[PDB]
């Protein structure tokens, strides 16, 4: 497939109907998933990689992801996002912190996986989704908490490591 | 092979499975190894050249280097990096200072070489790696120190010149 890059602007990106991958990285340390961004996939080998130094905070205004099967979200700080709306066609959501909190809610139909390194006193909380997986290492004080607001459609699989 | 250039953005670079070389220089004196950069090698003639006026500090968030055999790191200031993770497939790490400190840790299986010109009162400290080599010139006050925290798998070979 083809590889498509988001900018610090408003992007209107449309995939090849093939193995295509969407990059929502940084530009000068400025986020590229931004207001009004609309992304569209085509055929079923579609990936969105969202990577940011800054904390993920929510989906930004007017953003719509569609036809993209896998969403990877990685932050230098906390993640807080909800994906029960704006996002359609998403089978797999993977969220990644190292050393800060996570507060994620997925739509049913989406397999959530919340990987967290060096969790320390930070709290993971996840909700909704189809199959959920929590994978937390370096844990300490941190609560892990699943389905407190909305249960999973499928299986829960927490795992937690402490040193 | 083919020759691939990193930008001040998020790069998704994939080698030919051949003699390919990856350039991670500067753009306006802004680093090109940056958040979310993912690099991928293929076959075994793979080189990453990372060159920066600014001190090397750590691998940036979400960066994954993979399938790349040789990593060259050159800085106008200090180097501090650990490569026992994030980097996979790495047989050779070479780090280069001129007139500032070095604090490097390599994974076993990786041959470390820490070359330092005009060391002066700056301290070299290295750890881990397979074969390690320290090559220090213009030395003065500077301590040289190997395996204080983790020994080498193979041979140590320090050499130190003072004027
Ligand atoms: Ca597609
Ligand atoms: Ca954008
Ligand atoms: Ca698709
Ligand atoms: Ca880059
Ligand atoms: Ca290659
Ligand atoms: Ca290779």
UniProtKB/Swiss-Prot annotation, chains A, B:
It is found in: Secreted, Cell wall, S-layer. It comes from the Bacteria. Transmembrane segments: none annotated. The S-layer is a paracrystalline mono-layered assembly of proteins which coats the surface of bacteria. Probably acts as a physical barrier to parasites and lytic enzymes. The calcium binding of this protein may mediate surface attachment by ionic bridging between the S-layer and a specific membrane-associated oligosaccharide. This is S-layer protein. It comes from Caulobacter vibrioides (strain ATCC 19089 / CIP 103742 / CB 15). The gene is rsaA. The chain holds residues 249 to 411 of 1026 of the full protein.
């Amino acid at each position: 497939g083809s590889t498509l890059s988001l900018t610090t602007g408003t992007d209107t990106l449309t995939g090849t109907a093939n193995n295509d991958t969407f990059v929502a990285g940084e530009v000068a340390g400025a986020a590229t998933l931004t207001v009004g961004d609309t992304l569209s996939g085509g055929a079923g080998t579609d990936v969105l990689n969202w990577v940011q130094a800054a904390a993920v905070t929510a989906l930004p205004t007017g953003v719509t992801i569609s036809g993209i099967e896998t969403m990877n979200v990685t932050s230098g700080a906390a993640i807080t996002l909800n994906t029960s709306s704006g996002v359609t066609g998403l089978t797999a959501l993977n969220t990644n912190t190292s050393g800060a909190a996570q507060t994620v809610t997925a739509g049913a139909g989406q397999n959530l996986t919340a990987t967290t390194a060096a969790q320390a006193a930070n709290n993971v909380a996840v909700d909704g989704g189809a199959n959920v997986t929590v994978a937390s290492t370096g844990v300490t004080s941190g609560t892990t908490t699943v389905g407190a607001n909305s249960a999973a459609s499928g299986t829960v699989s927490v795992s937690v490591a402490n040193s």
